[PDB]
Each structure stands twice: as C-alpha cells, then as structure tokens.
C-alpha cells in the first residue's frame, strides 16, 4: 500500500536513468553536440546527483524530513518540466543539474523516512522490491520513451516524469510527521502517534528500542569514524564502489539506446533491444530476491565478472572484425548476456553483504561516501566513455571493461571471495 | 569384425597419443631432464608421424596397397615394444619416430584402403563411426595407462600398445590382395570379382563405374592442380590445418594428465582428471554423430572457439590469482569446457567440411597435403608449447591459446561460408 506509492519513487529513479537512457537514444534532433558534451549532458545529470548527494543528508541535518522530501518531488516535478524544453547550452547544463540534485536527493532520503515510518525489521527482501520498481521503472521509461515518435515528445515524457512526480508531490503530500526524526529530536510525540497510526500497539517499545537505538548508537560510535581504520577500510568500500561501478550499467544504458542507433539505421529494434534489455532486466533483478539467499555471496559475483569479461570479448570481436551489423543483432545477444550477468550477481548481492559487512556502530556519513565516490564512478563512465563510443569505431570498450571485470575481478577474489572449491 | 577391427586401427591410432598422456604423468621418474626434452620427445613422435605420413601414398603407389597396410601394422609393433623399454632418450627419440612412422601410416593409409576392400558406399559417416571407436582408443589408451600403477608397468602397456598393434594386422592377416589397386593398375580382374564378394554386384557396377570414373577423372585432374589459385585454395587448408591444431587437444591431452597431475597435485585426477574428462570428450563426440546436420557448422566453429577463448581466459585468470590447489579443481573443469568446445566444434567438423570444399572430383593431393600442415600445427604445439610448461607460471598458454581460439574466430566469419545449402 503506502509502501507501493513510495516504490513509485524508486521507480522513478528508473525512469530518469531509462529516459537519459531514451535521452541518449533521441538525442541528436534536439540538437546535443555532441556525443562529448552529451558526455558532459550526462555529466551535468550526475553531477547534480552528486552535490545534490553530499548536500542530501546534512540539509536533512538542518531542516527535518518532511516538508523536505515534499520540497524534492517539487524539485522533480520543477526539473523534468524545466527539461520539458530545451533551449541553449544554458538549459541542458542546468536542466541536467536541477533533475540530478533531485535524483541523488531522491534516492538518498528514500530509506531514512522510511526508517522513520517503517520498522528497522522492514528493510529486507521488499527493499529489494524496491530495487526491481526502479527496474519496472526502466521498463515504462525506455517503452513509452520509443513509444513516442517525434520531437517535442521526450520533452513531452519530462513532462510524463512530472505527472508521476506530481503524484510524488501527492506521494509525500500525505505524511504525518517524522517520526523517528522526533524520536531522535527529542519530540518523540508525533513519533509514537504516527506508530500507532496504522499497526496498533503491540511491538513497539521494541521497535522504539531498536530505531532509537540505530540513531542513537550511530551518534555513539560516529566518534572514532573520519580518521582510519574504519576510515581506510571504507575507502576500500569505496575503491570497492569503483571497481563495481566501473564495469557498470547506468552510462551502459545510455549509450546501449545510443548505438541502438549508431549501429542500425530505423529504431524498431532500440524498441526490442531497449525494451527486451530490460525486460530482462527485471526478470534479472527479479532473480535478485532468489540468488541472494540461492547461490553463494561470491562465486555469482565472480561468475558476473567472468560473464562480463566474455560478452565484452565475443561482442568487441564482432566489432572490430568489421562486421558491426552481426556484432548488433548480436549486440542485443552479447550485450544482453552480459545484462543477465550484471542482473545475477552485482546489483543485489554484493549490496548486501556491504552493509552486511560493517559492525552493526554505523551507516550513514560513511556508506553515504561510498556513494559519493561510487557516484564519482557513473560520472567518469557518463562524461569520458560515450566520447570514444563516437570515433574509434570502437573495440577499445569492451575489452577495457574486460580488463575491468578483470581488475575488479582481482578486487573480486583477493578482496571478497573466499580462495577454496 | 571388419570394420571393427579396422576401426580397431583407428583406436590404436589415438591411443598412441593417449599413451603419451599417462606418460606425461609419469614424466620426471623415467630419467627426462627437463619437460623440455619431453617437448622434443613428443616433436619425435610426430616427426616418424610426418616422413611416415607422406610416404605413405607414393609408396602405397610403387610397391601396393595390402603389403602396405600390413606393413605400417608392423611399424606398429616394432615402435611400440621399441618403446616398451628405457636407458637414455634415445629410444625415446627414434621410438617415438618409428612410433610415430606408423601413426602417420594410419592416418595416410587406412581410410583410403577400407575405400578399396569396401564400396564407395562406407567410409563416410561410419568412417565417422571409426572416428567413434579411435576416441574410444584414445580415451581407454590414457585410461589404461594411468589404470597400470608404474612406469614399468605401463611399459608393458606398450608392449600392450603391440598388442592392439598386431590385431589390425591380424585383421588384415587373412585378407586378400588390394582391390582398387587392382582396378586403377590394370590387374583389376580380382578387383571386378571383390566387388562381387563384399557388397553384391547389383550396385557395384555403378560403383566399380564410380571408382573407374573418379580414377579416371583423376588421371585427368592432378595437373591444373600444384601452382596458383588452387594453391591458393591449399594455402589457405593449409591455414584451416594450423587453427585447426594450434586450437586443441593434442597438446593438452597428453599434458593435461601432465596438468591434471603435475597441476593436479597427485594424479587421482589424472584417472578422473584426465580419464573423466576423457569420457566428457566421447559425451561430446556421441554429439557429434547426431549434431552435424541442424544448425550451422559455421556458427558453432563460432560459438566453438568462442567458449575455447571462455575457458581459455577463465583458466587464465582463475591462475593469476594463484589459486592453484582451487584453479586445478577448476582446471579439470576450464579444460572440460576448453574440450568440450573443441568437442561441439573443431576435432570433427573441420575435417569434414575439408572435403565439402575442394571439388567432388579432385580431392587427395589437397586433402592429404592439408594434413602435412595440419601435422605441422600438431608437432610445433608439441615441441614449442610444453616446453613453456617449466617456466612462467602461465595465465599465458590458454591466455595466449584465447588469442588462437580467437583469430580463429576472426578468420571464421572474415573467410568461411556456410556450407549448408
């Protein structure tokens, strides 16, 4: 219920990485140049997410939860509006920040009230159905994306990502105060009372016990976390959150719609192949929920890693081999394996173990920079790569992210494996 | 029993390199100095292999063809209770030659004399059957080897490898005289009249008609044949024999009980290792009788040497990361793949799509000119390759025999057609 309407959220951050994913399939006609600066449109994007990120939970800090994540899906529906039109090299630039700082705050502050609102004993397997709802998310993205078939109409489907976000506007418009805000803040009423709002009663002096004392034992060990051990091994989490999100999906989507294009004259199979790719796509991280507890917490991991490395392999043969054609209906068959891998081990399962991984002293500055530079990642990927997708008629790609599936394969199995069988 | 003990030398035949298997188990307790010596031991081998390959034809043209088949048999015991012995490498050296001389009398010979004795209405897919019982004759040839618990011991498994090796020529014993040899050498009344007894004389009158009409087209066939564009089409059957062995098993058979064991840490999984995977190889093989004609040869030399590549990279890294009581586990495994690949793709089909392309009426210069190239692949894998195996610590075979797989994958779809049409 109230939990499928803030999944609308979640979903919405698949629908803005599926509709730059659509941004970098349309693109051209709205007059980009070029594929660098589109570099540096998707640059813009993220970056937006990035000191929108930074400034996510500190203006928390200072103003509370509420009127906030209001004041964000206000900013969703303001953005993707503002991006409703495009103008000069002004509103691309700008455009691009305004719905980045939004999508960064967005999925950052999504679980903290929803820490406030829903029970510490709820983050599991549903959390991961929030992770597929951003993937559904790709799923409506990318299909009423080619959907349409002419040009003020993405711009058009900006404005299909505010009719959601003015029901995110609603989506917040609904909530009582902020619990645990409270409990933390020492105005514990309206905690309490949005607490018996809806489950009557009986496990609470335990769930009072068990929020109050996540924030209150993060405000505890907080102490000995800027400076090292802890601090060291989290900038492994973070080289960790490099090597993970550098063989990685978000740029890959956006130029997988781009050479849906650059590869095949006529957009037909930007339909079968955007939407096929994500149709397994949710199949796959509706396969998450199965192999977290299925398989193991490091051979799938590694088996993605491999099956990267080979689809990056065969494909970037078919690509320099001259045949560029066969290299793309396989494109879809290589590229797509390749999807199954990213979707069977490292969306999911390495995330749980990170936070699996922590002693349970604390999260949130400390993961939220694993974020940070694992934002970084997607930023490189965006701004640099799609540059070199343009020129080289391009083998450089995949066998540099084999290698990458190799170096963060070597992170694999010297920093989170185990050695034996 | 004909064609069961003729297939009979087709199972002798592999077994000569199976028996180079259980011996590249026992190496370094027979007086070796180093795994260097075993590469030039094994280049002996096929070196007997290759002057006693091409002489096989011309010879079979001065003096007959049953005294010839008979013959080779013979080379047979003599390389083989020649080789039932050791002191210094020197019966190495000239044992595996005469060794080898026979092996080359095989594969030169045998095929071509059950063309003769039997119609033109045999030797193709139950030739494929000898196919069938040679991987038998290799797969039961390391079996025994590594059944026999000493070097001794399986010395008198070579004096075993004259057992095999006089039972063909017991099944050319009370054989008769050479039929088409008879028929195109002008002495062909009991060529006429064998025809008679074998098959039955209602076909045999189109197919002594056949073998008169191919010998004669023949007689007028060989001189347009040597110089350019047909030895352009040699050349390059030539370049189909060199990816044909610097792609495969006839390294890594032998030196996989060499890597089962020597790798494998014990050779328990040189019987499971390599026997079992052996017995993945017929798994395979059996796929093969069937698999020839649905899908595509082309695609699945494709997808063949493609998953050669997979396993041949997988090995690959799956040892620098040095995990090598592990990565062997994985080995038996990278290899069945590597085989199983071979398997679906290369051993077979290659060498039947040799005959679907040079013309119905000239074939044999060609073909068995082919198989002196394809020869030379197999010997510079023997000396050149395992003589590696003392030195890197290699990610660099099967990361370098990824490359080979894999200009075998470029050169697949750069120059071959499909042959089905």
Known sequence: LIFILGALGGLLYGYDNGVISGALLFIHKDIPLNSTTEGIVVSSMLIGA???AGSSGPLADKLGRRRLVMLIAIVF???????????NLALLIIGRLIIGLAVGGSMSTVPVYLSEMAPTEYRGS??????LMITIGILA??????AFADIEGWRWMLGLAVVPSVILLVGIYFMPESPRWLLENRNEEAARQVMKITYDDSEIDKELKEMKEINAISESTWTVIKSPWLGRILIVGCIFAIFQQFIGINAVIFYSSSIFAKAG???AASILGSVGIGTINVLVTIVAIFVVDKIDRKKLLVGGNIGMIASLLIMAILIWTIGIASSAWIIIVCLSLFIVFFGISWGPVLWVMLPELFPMRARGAATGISALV????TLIVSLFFPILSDALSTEWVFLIFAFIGVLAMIFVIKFLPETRG
């Open 50 to 52: 990035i000191v929108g």
């Open 77 to 87: 529906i303001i953005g993707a509006l503002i991006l409703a039109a495009s103008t």
């Open 126 to 131: 549903l959390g991961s159905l929030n992770q």
């Open 141 to 146: 993205a990318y299909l009423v994306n080619y």
């Open 265 to 267: 004259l006529g957009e």
């Open 374 to 377: 694992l934002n970084i990642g």
